[PDB]
Amino acid sequence: DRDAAMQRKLEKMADQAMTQMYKQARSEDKRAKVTSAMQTMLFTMLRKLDNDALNNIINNARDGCVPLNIIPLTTAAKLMVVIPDYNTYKNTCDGTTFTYASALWEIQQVVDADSKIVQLSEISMDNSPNLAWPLIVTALRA
Amino acid sequence: DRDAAMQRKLEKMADQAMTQMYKQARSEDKRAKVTSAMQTMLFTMLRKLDNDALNNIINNARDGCVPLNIIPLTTAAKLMVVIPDYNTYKNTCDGTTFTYASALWEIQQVVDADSKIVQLSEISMDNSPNLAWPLIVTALRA
Amino acid sequence: AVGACVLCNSQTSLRCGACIRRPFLCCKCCYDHVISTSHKLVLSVNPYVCNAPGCDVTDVTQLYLGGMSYYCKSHKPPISFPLCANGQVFGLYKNTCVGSDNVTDFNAIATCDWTNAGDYILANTCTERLKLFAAETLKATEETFKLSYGIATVREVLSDRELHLSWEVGKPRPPLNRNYVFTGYRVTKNSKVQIGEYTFEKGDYGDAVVYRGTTTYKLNVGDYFVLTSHTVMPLSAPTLVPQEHYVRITGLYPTLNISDEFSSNVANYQKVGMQKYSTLQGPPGTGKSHFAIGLALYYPSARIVYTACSHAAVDALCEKALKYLPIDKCSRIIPARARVECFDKFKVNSTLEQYVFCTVNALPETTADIVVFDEISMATNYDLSVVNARLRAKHYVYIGDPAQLPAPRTLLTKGTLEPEYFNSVCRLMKTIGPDMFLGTCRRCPAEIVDTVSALVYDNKLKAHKDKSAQCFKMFYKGVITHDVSSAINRPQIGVVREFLTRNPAWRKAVFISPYNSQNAVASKILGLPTQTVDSSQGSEYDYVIFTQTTETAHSCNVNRFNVAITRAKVGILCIMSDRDLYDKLQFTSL
Amino acid sequence: SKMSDVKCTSVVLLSVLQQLRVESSSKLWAQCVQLHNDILLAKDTTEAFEKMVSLLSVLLSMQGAVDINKLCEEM
Amino acid sequence: WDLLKYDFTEERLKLFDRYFKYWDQTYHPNCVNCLDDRCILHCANFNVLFSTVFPPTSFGPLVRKIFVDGVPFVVSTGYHFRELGVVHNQDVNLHSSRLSFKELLVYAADPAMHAASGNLLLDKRTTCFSVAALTNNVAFQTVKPGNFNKDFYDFAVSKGFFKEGSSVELKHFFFAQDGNAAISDYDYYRYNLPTMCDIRQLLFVVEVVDKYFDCYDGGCINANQVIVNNLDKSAGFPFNKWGKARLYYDSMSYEDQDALFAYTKRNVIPTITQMNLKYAISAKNRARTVAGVSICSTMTNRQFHQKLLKSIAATRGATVVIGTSKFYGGWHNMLKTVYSDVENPHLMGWDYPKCDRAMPNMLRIMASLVLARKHTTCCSLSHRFYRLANECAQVLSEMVMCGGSLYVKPGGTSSGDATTAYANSVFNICQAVTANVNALLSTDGNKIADKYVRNLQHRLYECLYRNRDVDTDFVNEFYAYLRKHFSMMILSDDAVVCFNSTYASQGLVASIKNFKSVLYYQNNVFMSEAKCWTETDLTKGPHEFCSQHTMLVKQGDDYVYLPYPDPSRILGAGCFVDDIVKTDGTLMIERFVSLAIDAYPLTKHPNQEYADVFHLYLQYIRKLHDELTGHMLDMYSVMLTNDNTSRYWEPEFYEAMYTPHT
Ligand SMILES: Nc1ncnc2c1ncn2[C@@H]1O[C@H](COP(=O)(O)OP(=O)(O)O)[C@@H](O)[C@H]1O
Ligand SMILES: [Mg+2]
Ligand SMILES: [Zn+2]
Ligand SMILES: [Zn+2]
Ligand SMILES: [Zn+2]
Ligand SMILES: [Zn+2]
Ligand SMILES: [Zn+2]
């Protein structure tokens, strides 16, 4: 019984050590991977929502058609968005109208990285390959 | 086994005494550190004092006792004005010099809430939305 | 303290104690490694030694996990159980460890001393994790080789500008140059403590070293020196980021009439934009490092980090960029000690500038839009992993040629290393081919290129100049003085000195020789700018005097001689030793 | 559960923004905090989705902060 | 006025002789000359009015230049309270040679050197008086959002939670704050106005409240008798720059802690209190701020008040339910003591809007004097006055460190002093007694049919406005009347009343409208009746007390009152955490065991969606243990020998938590 008592004391201390080491290892592993885990969780939750505006802005961000400021909610407010190629312009921009964030915007001002004003008539398959891409389009919420 | 019991008590009380001694030595070598830190803080604050102005206002006191709230207000050489919006800035310290506490102050620096330097030409009615309010202006007594 | 097995990336908590780098190993892989090799020490969270009062057993098949600790055969608690058994080695995550078949190459990588040549050809054609582990242990072995260099001491001081040296009897003597430093001792009774950081270089006359120190302490005769050690950091990033072929250029933007000089490489610029990483292989002086600056002029908005393994190559790249790029937006990043004298004409050491030039070793962790690695021959897999870890990027461009001289590889002393095993980039270049290839010499005259298209390149290069007849091949015996453990050829230097006052247009030709000793000692006798062949690569000069110091396997190396001669721009005089080497080239009479 | 999925996604999004040191720019952090708090105090799902678009535009505007292509290829 | 002027005694006497000329009780402009605490309140009430005509720069600490080892310090040798007048220290050494640890602590705690060395401040973001800027730049402290426990949320939504239209929905979150939060919360001290009280009425309410606090015992204790709960807590400014409270409770022996405590009985020590933003889960997006008081104040306040405070926390069955657990039948016992033989019982509960920031200084001084009535033998009159002065200088009207800047707190209780909940309980009882007095006096008197209550009203008016000495017989009679017809249950700002509905309808006992009137004229707040509840049926219990609803269940064979929380609160605590490692789950199974203990009484709720929260927590505990054992068996190859975690997903471990056997 004395031998069994010291056996149980030894195995109790073994369980103490196992639990403490597991807690330490898991805590340091979770605190180490806090940025990438949070970003992956955020994009998982974003995909699960499957909102049409969120999916639109994310798909445009993958192509590089990201905004330059916070997308505004008030009507007739200003959105600045960089378009990096004619492909992203052809789908989003129809005439003077700009489809973005599941909303329609009125194109106001197109500039280049030289800040040169470019008319909407100059964006085409032939003249743009000489332009200073990426364009930056400033539009108003309609 | 009877003397082994006394040996158990000997080792137990010896370890307890050693732990108590270690704890007491640690708490006595941590007391001197905070004593030195408090002394250095007090003496640096002594060296910060504007001795001439403080001496004047304390010799003007009849009992030698003055309110604390007037110690900066009459002797501090530097004033920090925290301003939440542009109308308040125009009211209190517009221009490179202004008046507060019956004294004359000259603007030596302006920073924003981001601790970035702001020039006096950038604090305007139309440039107000582009500034990270509040603005902290630092002025020196003239 | 858990980790990932090197050759299977399972979870583990074991490491090999005998290995220099102490790599993590899963249970199956650790059993396979220890039961077959001579390594018999395994470190868990606690080391696997025997926990008797006093016992020293490390072999893992002898041990048991008894009671609450690891105990040997006749010290164990009566309750067992064996550690190294059941085809595994007992560790954490025991029943999730999948083994491999790469415990046959890992044994060779861990065991080998990097003396033969096959160790490098097995350290560069293995799997991707072993490509990193082998580079790590190779750097570790190269560092620990310095621990076998003889302890110095001072004989006396007649002249305080030139120390006297005395090596310990019975040990090898390290070479005397700038790359090696020393730190002292004063072990008499009385201060076994360091006395400063010193460095050495030989003197021409007698036995003397014209030393240098970080402080100004003198050595009472008991004070002495020992070469210190550079601990080698761990590395994680892959040697080459996996390639993806984009349909169109992403992240980069073209320009409006880039120039009238870079109008030929436009297609290669577009190809660079299309692919994740690109490789440019070309014979020397064909437009490789003048391709990178043209690329910068083609992607003006793209932040670019230029890097190289050497200092005298990135300095030439900096000078070229100053000649072409806007000088306002440049930088130059130098190490804290800055052993060599670097380029001080831009705003030095500003990492956040648009165009940033640095060595591989001093790269700071940052981002970019395209990173241009240059002279990949000088770079080992350690440098590739370093540049792939510190600098994130959208596009990678590796420019260089395998036929130039490779990295030093001081440990290698048996056999020769073929080009296709210099590193992963050169292996890619030689296996499937470069992504961009330009063979036409735009720098060197017709004679020297028409001779180098016979030594190294099999009659491939046409070129563009006219042979100015200022290409000279000299016959001179050149008696040997093996002085600084690198040879010095005093009579060849005498030939040069006696026929450098007969050449009024050669007063500024750079002096090139394979041996650093003669290359450094020539500065007194002729006063020309001096340069070793290894660092001359990547830089051009208007006139070159090359001296084959001694006949060996180092100075008669066709790659070294080819990278030496082709730095000339209008003419080069070279004095040769090998009756063959002087005959394979076609130069003037003398 | 769609209203409560938006209110948790905004929490994770603001945690990501705080990790990306958006907190250093007080003018941007004030807008992010306002949007996050107005999403949490929402009764209508359309308002919460519009404010989620505005709050995600802060994450999408900073090009060098996150790798959108790598993050969206893990799904 | 002259800026250096601080002694307005002659001006106060002129004001008193000009307006209250025939008020025939003696007035002391400086309350250091008062005869007792009944005279401190009277003269302090007059000083509250008279201090509104004097410059605000003349109040606060009174500094003086002393010399220690030849170097000139500027230290506070007094104070000018708006309520207590001018107070001078009794132990002032103008020339010293060495500073002991006690004197070093005293000279570091007080704001004399910090304000005298810092820059002048003009903070236009607040209307509060800004004293100084200690650093060279303002600090803008933000509040982070919470950490999302996605595993628990996925488990919950897999169980049918958070559906559209469901009764249980997430309403408690971690609300983030910008840099302008800590200075926007402190600006709420703009709701503290100087309120002059009815002194002939307050002096009777004090006697009734003291009757309420008669069952306890208190007095000074030694430094070896003080027990501190957690020593790893902040020591306030500037002491948090070198360690926690453990450092200063270890570095000071009992001898120089008793020396400091005896110093505070003859000298006033001003103290700086930090404002700390609170990072916790809440249902509203307004930032919450706590007051970190210095260790030099907390130590002496513990040594002064802790005997009485522990005596209150150890009494069962009283009005002030502090120290009474809600487990093991403690909630049922509390609710049965509230229903203490009232005749026509209706339950009532009210709210104090901006309770800690709108509380008048007169009522805080009243609470401090009521707590200090236990020191009738350990302390002299001057000792009790200087302890009250230290309380006012360190708690009531202090220097506040808010973002690296020293401001002046206009008044109101700080939520970080040693006696916060207990002084708040005294304030709550005082307001309730005042409401009852006003209700009884504002009744007609010719309409009161009961001849006993008419004579009670007559004698109440006599004891208020026609009697200057305490009539202990009538104070006992009114206390008996209040206990019989207005039974109370107080936890520091929560109160359940079991009043007589017939008397309250006849106006003989306080109603909700009486509390609204009293809080209007005595708290400078408006108490909307949308936050105050009335319960006509006792079988449903109080609507809400300490954020817990009450329901009557059949436990065993008898009916008992069980408290259940908001299911939104428990689900929000499960889903949102304040640390990244509380998201692992397997690391924190006790975290969910405690939440299941709190959420157990929901299983008796008639709404099934409420009853499913406890089962959700039990199932998540079981899943957490399953995956914890899986991960442990993976990290090794052996299971744990002893595992007693099976009892945490059995409902008996939680059922026994609300059974009166313990
Ligand atoms: N398109 C070109 N037209 C004229 N000269 C060129 C052109 N491209 C390169 N050169 C010349 O050829 C040389 C090649 O230099 P560099 O690119 O450094 O060669 P390497 O890359 O082999 O070191 C440059 O000095 C430059 O003067
Ligand atoms: Mg080159
Ligand atoms: Zn090994
Ligand atoms: Zn493995
Ligand atoms: Zn042994
Ligand atoms: Zn009085
Ligand atoms: Zn007392």
Side-chain angles (χ1 to χ4, degrees), chain C residues 397-416:
Chain C
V397 169
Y398 309 100
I399 55 185
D401 179 64
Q404 327 275 96
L405 35 71
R409 312 190 190 280
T410 9
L411 262 299
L412 174 60
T413 180
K414 271 184 294 180
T416 170

PDB file of all heavy atoms in Angstrom, chain C residues 397-416:
ATOM      1  N   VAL C 397      13.573  38.736 -60.151  1.00  0.00           N
ATOM      2  CA  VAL C 397      14.419  38.602 -61.332  1.00  0.00           C
ATOM      3  C   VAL C 397      15.826  38.256 -60.880  1.00  0.00           C
ATOM      4  O   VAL C 397      16.452  39.033 -60.150  1.00  0.00           O
ATOM      5  CB  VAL C 397      14.431  39.875 -62.189  1.00  0.00           C
ATOM      6  CG1 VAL C 397      15.523  39.790 -63.233  1.00  0.00           C
ATOM      7  CG2 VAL C 397      13.103  40.049 -62.863  1.00  0.00           C
ATOM      8  N   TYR C 398      16.330  37.112 -61.325  1.00  0.00           N
ATOM      9  CA  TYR C 398      17.689  36.680 -61.033  1.00  0.00           C
ATOM     10  C   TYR C 398      18.516  36.812 -62.302  1.00  0.00           C
ATOM     11  O   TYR C 398      18.240  36.133 -63.295  1.00  0.00           O
ATOM     12  CB  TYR C 398      17.711  35.239 -60.527  1.00  0.00           C
ATOM     13  CG  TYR C 398      16.747  34.960 -59.397  1.00  0.00           C
ATOM     14  CD1 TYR C 398      15.529  34.345 -59.636  1.00  0.00           C
ATOM     15  CD2 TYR C 398      17.062  35.297 -58.092  1.00  0.00           C
ATOM     16  CE1 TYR C 398      14.649  34.083 -58.609  1.00  0.00           C
ATOM     17  CE2 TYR C 398      16.187  35.041 -57.057  1.00  0.00           C
ATOM     18  CZ  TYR C 398      14.984  34.433 -57.322  1.00  0.00           C
ATOM     19  OH  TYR C 398      14.113  34.176 -56.292  1.00  0.00           O
ATOM     20  N   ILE C 399      19.525  37.674 -62.268  1.00  0.00           N
ATOM     21  CA  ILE C 399      20.402  37.898 -63.410  1.00  0.00           C
ATOM     22  C   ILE C 399      21.790  37.400 -63.041  1.00  0.00           C
ATOM     23  O   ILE C 399      22.266  37.646 -61.928  1.00  0.00           O
ATOM     24  CB  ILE C 399      20.428  39.380 -63.831  1.00  0.00           C
ATOM     25  CG1 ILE C 399      20.805  40.282 -62.660  1.00  0.00           C
ATOM     26  CG2 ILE C 399      19.075  39.800 -64.345  1.00  0.00           C
ATOM     27  CD1 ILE C 399      20.734  41.757 -62.978  1.00  0.00           C
ATOM     28  N   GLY C 400      22.414  36.668 -63.950  1.00  0.00           N
ATOM     29  CA  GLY C 400      23.739  36.142 -63.691  1.00  0.00           C
ATOM     30  C   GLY C 400      24.082  35.065 -64.690  1.00  0.00           C
ATOM     31  O   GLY C 400      23.263  34.666 -65.521  1.00  0.00           O
ATOM     32  N   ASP C 401      25.322  34.594 -64.593  1.00  0.00           N
ATOM     33  CA  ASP C 401      25.811  33.579 -65.506  1.00  0.00           C
ATOM     34  C   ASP C 401      26.566  32.502 -64.741  1.00  0.00           C
ATOM     35  O   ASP C 401      27.307  32.810 -63.801  1.00  0.00           O
ATOM     36  CB  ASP C 401      26.725  34.204 -66.561  1.00  0.00           C
ATOM     37  CG  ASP C 401      27.283  33.184 -67.522  1.00  0.00           C
ATOM     38  OD1 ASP C 401      26.494  32.560 -68.261  1.00  0.00           O
ATOM     39  OD2 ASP C 401      28.517  33.013 -67.545  1.00  0.00           O
ATOM     40  N   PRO C 402      26.401  31.232 -65.119  1.00  0.00           N
ATOM     41  CA  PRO C 402      27.127  30.165 -64.415  1.00  0.00           C
ATOM     42  C   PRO C 402      28.594  30.069 -64.791  1.00  0.00           C
ATOM     43  O   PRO C 402      29.399  29.621 -63.966  1.00  0.00           O
ATOM     44  CB  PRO C 402      26.364  28.895 -64.818  1.00  0.00           C
ATOM     45  CG  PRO C 402      25.045  29.375 -65.322  1.00  0.00           C
ATOM     46  CD  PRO C 402      25.323  30.693 -65.959  1.00  0.00           C
ATOM     47  N   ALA C 403      28.973  30.472 -66.005  1.00  0.00           N
ATOM     48  CA  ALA C 403      30.355  30.314 -66.447  1.00  0.00           C
ATOM     49  C   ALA C 403      31.317  31.266 -65.750  1.00  0.00           C
ATOM     50  O   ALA C 403      32.532  31.105 -65.900  1.00  0.00           O
ATOM     51  CB  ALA C 403      30.456  30.498 -67.959  1.00  0.00           C
ATOM     52  N   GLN C 404      30.817  32.246 -65.006  1.00  0.00           N
ATOM     53  CA  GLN C 404      31.680  33.068 -64.175  1.00  0.00           C
ATOM     54  C   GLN C 404      32.105  32.268 -62.945  1.00  0.00           C
ATOM     55  O   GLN C 404      31.708  31.116 -62.753  1.00  0.00           O
ATOM     56  CB  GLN C 404      30.961  34.351 -63.775  1.00  0.00           C
ATOM     57  CG  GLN C 404      29.998  34.887 -64.823  1.00  0.00           C
ATOM     58  CD  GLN C 404      30.674  35.756 -65.860  1.00  0.00           C
ATOM     59  OE1 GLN C 404      31.027  35.288 -66.941  1.00  0.00           O
ATOM     60  NE2 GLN C 404      30.864  37.026 -65.534  1.00  0.00           N
ATOM     61  N   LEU C 405      32.917  32.879 -62.088  1.00  0.00           N
ATOM     62  CA  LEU C 405      33.422  32.138 -60.940  1.00  0.00           C
ATOM     63  C   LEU C 405      32.332  31.981 -59.882  1.00  0.00           C
ATOM     64  O   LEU C 405      31.533  32.896 -59.665  1.00  0.00           O
ATOM     65  CB  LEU C 405      34.658  32.812 -60.340  1.00  0.00           C
ATOM     66  CG  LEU C 405      34.845  34.326 -60.296  1.00  0.00           C
ATOM     67  CD1 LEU C 405      33.912  34.980 -59.314  1.00  0.00           C
ATOM     68  CD2 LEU C 405      36.280  34.632 -59.921  1.00  0.00           C
ATOM     69  N   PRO C 406      32.267  30.831 -59.221  1.00  0.00           N
ATOM     70  CA  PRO C 406      31.231  30.607 -58.206  1.00  0.00           C
ATOM     71  C   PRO C 406      31.602  31.158 -56.843  1.00  0.00           C
ATOM     72  O   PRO C 406      32.593  31.881 -56.699  1.00  0.00           O
ATOM     73  CB  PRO C 406      31.116  29.082 -58.173  1.00  0.00           C
ATOM     74  CG  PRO C 406      32.492  28.625 -58.489  1.00  0.00           C
ATOM     75  CD  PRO C 406      33.053  29.613 -59.478  1.00  0.00           C
ATOM     76  N   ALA C 407      30.793  30.826 -55.836  1.00  0.00           N
ATOM     77  CA  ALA C 407      31.101  31.182 -54.463  1.00  0.00           C
ATOM     78  C   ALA C 407      32.390  30.487 -54.024  1.00  0.00           C
ATOM     79  O   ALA C 407      32.780  29.471 -54.605  1.00  0.00           O
ATOM     80  CB  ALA C 407      29.940  30.788 -53.549  1.00  0.00           C
ATOM     81  N   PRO C 408      33.088  31.039 -53.009  1.00  0.00           N
ATOM     82  CA  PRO C 408      34.382  30.472 -52.598  1.00  0.00           C
ATOM     83  C   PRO C 408      34.369  28.982 -52.287  1.00  0.00           C
ATOM     84  O   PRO C 408      35.153  28.229 -52.874  1.00  0.00           O
ATOM     85  CB  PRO C 408      34.728  31.289 -51.348  1.00  0.00           C
ATOM     86  CG  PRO C 408      34.095  32.601 -51.591  1.00  0.00           C
ATOM     87  CD  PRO C 408      32.817  32.319 -52.329  1.00  0.00           C
ATOM     88  N   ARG C 409      33.486  28.550 -51.384  1.00  0.00           N
ATOM     89  CA  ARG C 409      33.397  27.157 -50.939  1.00  0.00           C
ATOM     90  C   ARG C 409      34.752  26.675 -50.409  1.00  0.00           C
ATOM     91  O   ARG C 409      35.406  25.796 -50.973  1.00  0.00           O
ATOM     92  CB  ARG C 409      32.880  26.248 -52.060  1.00  0.00           C
ATOM     93  CG  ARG C 409      31.646  26.785 -52.753  1.00  0.00           C
ATOM     94  CD  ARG C 409      31.018  25.756 -53.670  1.00  0.00           C
ATOM     95  NE  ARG C 409      29.978  26.352 -54.499  1.00  0.00           N
ATOM     96  CZ  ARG C 409      28.739  26.592 -54.085  1.00  0.00           C
ATOM     97  NH1 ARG C 409      28.381  26.286 -52.847  1.00  0.00           N
ATOM     98  NH2 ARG C 409      27.858  27.141 -54.908  1.00  0.00           N
ATOM     99  N   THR C 410      35.156  27.306 -49.304  1.00  0.00           N
ATOM    100  CA  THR C 410      36.471  27.052 -48.723  1.00  0.00           C
ATOM    101  C   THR C 410      36.647  25.599 -48.303  1.00  0.00           C
ATOM    102  O   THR C 410      37.759  25.065 -48.379  1.00  0.00           O
ATOM    103  CB  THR C 410      36.696  27.973 -47.524  1.00  0.00           C
ATOM    104  OG1 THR C 410      35.475  28.655 -47.211  1.00  0.00           O
ATOM    105  CG2 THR C 410      37.777  28.994 -47.833  1.00  0.00           C
ATOM    106  N   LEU C 411      35.573  24.945 -47.855  1.00  0.00           N
ATOM    107  CA  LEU C 411      35.689  23.565 -47.396  1.00  0.00           C
ATOM    108  C   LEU C 411      35.947  22.599 -48.545  1.00  0.00           C
ATOM    109  O   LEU C 411      36.585  21.561 -48.345  1.00  0.00           O
ATOM    110  CB  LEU C 411      34.426  23.155 -46.640  1.00  0.00           C
ATOM    111  CG  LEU C 411      34.472  23.226 -45.113  1.00  0.00           C
ATOM    112  CD1 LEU C 411      35.551  22.307 -44.572  1.00  0.00           C
ATOM    113  CD2 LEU C 411      34.700  24.648 -44.645  1.00  0.00           C
ATOM    114  N   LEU C 412      35.460  22.914 -49.742  1.00  0.00           N
ATOM    115  CA  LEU C 412      35.622  22.021 -50.882  1.00  0.00           C
ATOM    116  C   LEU C 412      37.085  21.970 -51.299  1.00  0.00           C
ATOM    117  O   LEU C 412      37.684  23.004 -51.610  1.00  0.00           O
ATOM    118  CB  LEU C 412      34.751  22.492 -52.044  1.00  0.00           C
ATOM    119  CG  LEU C 412      34.908  21.743 -53.367  1.00  0.00           C
ATOM    120  CD1 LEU C 412      34.580  20.277 -53.190  1.00  0.00           C
ATOM    121  CD2 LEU C 412      34.021  22.360 -54.428  1.00  0.00           C
ATOM    122  N   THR C 413      37.660  20.769 -51.303  1.00  0.00           N
ATOM    123  CA  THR C 413      39.046  20.604 -51.713  1.00  0.00           C
ATOM    124  C   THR C 413      39.300  19.357 -52.548  1.00  0.00           C
ATOM    125  O   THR C 413      40.457  19.099 -52.894  1.00  0.00           O
ATOM    126  CB  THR C 413      39.970  20.578 -50.487  1.00  0.00           C
ATOM    127  OG1 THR C 413      41.327  20.412 -50.914  1.00  0.00           O
ATOM    128  CG2 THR C 413      39.593  19.436 -49.558  1.00  0.00           C
ATOM    129  N   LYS C 414      38.275  18.579 -52.880  1.00  0.00           N
ATOM    130  CA  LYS C 414      38.431  17.411 -53.734  1.00  0.00           C
ATOM    131  C   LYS C 414      37.426  17.489 -54.871  1.00  0.00           C
ATOM    132  O   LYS C 414      36.231  17.685 -54.633  1.00  0.00           O
ATOM    133  CB  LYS C 414      38.248  16.111 -52.948  1.00  0.00           C
ATOM    134  CG  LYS C 414      39.533  15.581 -52.346  1.00  0.00           C
ATOM    135  CD  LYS C 414      39.317  14.242 -51.668  1.00  0.00           C
ATOM    136  CE  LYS C 414      38.413  14.377 -50.458  1.00  0.00           C
ATOM    137  NZ  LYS C 414      38.201  13.070 -49.778  1.00  0.00           N
ATOM    138  N   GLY C 415      37.913  17.338 -56.097  1.00  0.00           N
ATOM    139  CA  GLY C 415      37.057  17.412 -57.260  1.00  0.00           C
ATOM    140  C   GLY C 415      36.670  18.839 -57.594  1.00  0.00           C
ATOM    141  O   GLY C 415      37.041  19.803 -56.923  1.00  0.00           O
ATOM    142  N   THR C 416      35.895  18.966 -58.665  1.00  0.00           N
ATOM    143  CA  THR C 416      35.421  20.253 -59.140  1.00  0.00           C
ATOM    144  C   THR C 416      33.899  20.266 -59.166  1.00  0.00           C
ATOM    145  O   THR C 416      33.257  19.243 -59.421  1.00  0.00           O
ATOM    146  CB  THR C 416      35.965  20.570 -60.535  1.00  0.00           C
ATOM    147  OG1 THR C 416      35.302  21.728 -61.056  1.00  0.00           O
ATOM    148  CG2 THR C 416      35.742  19.394 -61.473  1.00  0.00           C
TER     149      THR C 416
END
